[PDB]
Curated annotation (Swiss-Prot):
Component of the ARISC complex, at least composed of UIMC1/RAP80, ABRAXAS1, BRCC3/BRCC36, BABAM2 and BABAM1/NBA1. Component of the BRCA1-A complex, at least composed of the BRCA1, BARD1, UIMC1/RAP80, ABRAXAS1, BRCC3/BRCC36, BABAM2 and BABAM1/NBA1. In the BRCA1-A complex, interacts directly with ABRAXAS1. Interacts with UBE2I. Interacts with NR6A1. Interacts with ESR1. Interacts with TSP57. Interacts with TRAIP. The tandem UIM domains form a continuous 60 Angstrom-long alpha-helix and mediate binding to 'Lys-63'-linked ubiquitins. UIM1 and UIM2 bind to the proximal and distal ubiquitin moieties and recognize an 'Ile-44'-centered hydrophobic patch. Since UIMs don't interact with the 'Lys-63' isopeptide bond the UIM-linker region between the 2 UIM domains determines the selectivity for 'Lys-63'-linkage, and its length is very important for specificity. The lineage of its organism: Eukaryota, Metazoa, Chordata, Craniata, Vertebrata. This is BRCA1-A complex subunit RAP80. It is found in: Nucleus. Belongs to the RAP80 family. Residues 48-61 have a biased composition (Polar residues). The chain holds residues 74 to 131 of 719 of the full protein. There is a cross-link at K7, K21 (Glycyl lysine isopeptide (Lys-Gly) (interchain with G-Cter in SUMO2)).
Length: 62
């Protein structure tokens, strides 16, 4: 085989349960937090575009 599973230590039943718990915390593999940040970045940009320009203190156009 690739190396030899015969020399590879097998995981115990308890170890398997812990592995599942870790996946649940990460949802799967990638951090869901990163995805949320990306969404927030786009939302902020859209909001800025929808935001009107600030009033001129001098009252001068453009």
């Amino acid at each position: 085989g690739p190396l030899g599973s015969r020399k590879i230590a097998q995981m115990t039943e308890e170890q398997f349960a812990l592995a599942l718990k870790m996946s649940e915390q990460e949802a799967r593999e990638v951090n869901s937090q990163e995805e949320e940040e990306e969404e927030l970045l786009r939302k902020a940009i859209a909001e800025s575009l929808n935001s009107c320009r600030p009033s001129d203190a001098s009252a001068t156009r453009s």
